[PDB]
Design a protein around this ligand. Structure first.
Ligand SMILES: Cn1cc(-c2ccccc2OCC2CC2)c2nn(CC3CCN(S(C)(=O)=O)CC3)cc2c1=O
Length: 125
């Protein structure tokens, strides 16, 4: 269909290894964004079938969403915090390059992104 398979969320052949930055990404960054009143469009992959968005996956090269990021963090999928930060950035980029600038979805992305960037400015060493 219009929708790709969702990104992989677990890695069965990697060690379990935390870093205090990965702990912060889950317990501070993701948890704060997840509970935000504007999170809901970003809590799962964009369902281009159900939302009737035939151009979405033509335009977006790297699908990403916070449900995938949440599962990745819970499964210790990321080897390092920069991989996770990259996924958040991708998610926001996708929204900004696809959607019309004055739309609610973009207003919502911006509020989430400000919060994200403020928490990343406080990323522990
Ligand atoms: C990340 N994302 C999520 C949703 C969405 C995924 C699941 C459920 C709802 C979703 O978007 C709802 C819109 C209200 C925020 C979505 N939907 N669309 C298509 C339209 C919907 C209507 N908006 S608008 C005029 O309201 O800003 C423009 C984009 C693009 C989307 C996107 O980039």
């Amino acid at each position: 269909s219009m929708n790709p398979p969702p990104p992989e969320t677990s890695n069965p052949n990697k060690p379990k290894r935390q870093t205090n930055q990965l702990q912060y990404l889950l317990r501070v960054v993701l948890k704060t964004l997840w509970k935000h009143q504007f999170a809901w469009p970003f809590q799962q992959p964009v369902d281009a079938v159900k939302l009737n968005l035939p151009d979405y996956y033509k335009i977006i090269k790297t699908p990403m969403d916070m449900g995938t990021i949440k599962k990745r963090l819970e499964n210790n999928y990321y080897w390092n915090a920069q991989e996770c930060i990259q996924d958040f950035n991708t998610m926001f980029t996708n929204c900004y390059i696809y959607n019309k600038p004055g739309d609610d979805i973009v207003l919502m992305a911006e509020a989430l992104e400000k919060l994200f960037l403020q928490k990343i400015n406080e990323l522990p060493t």
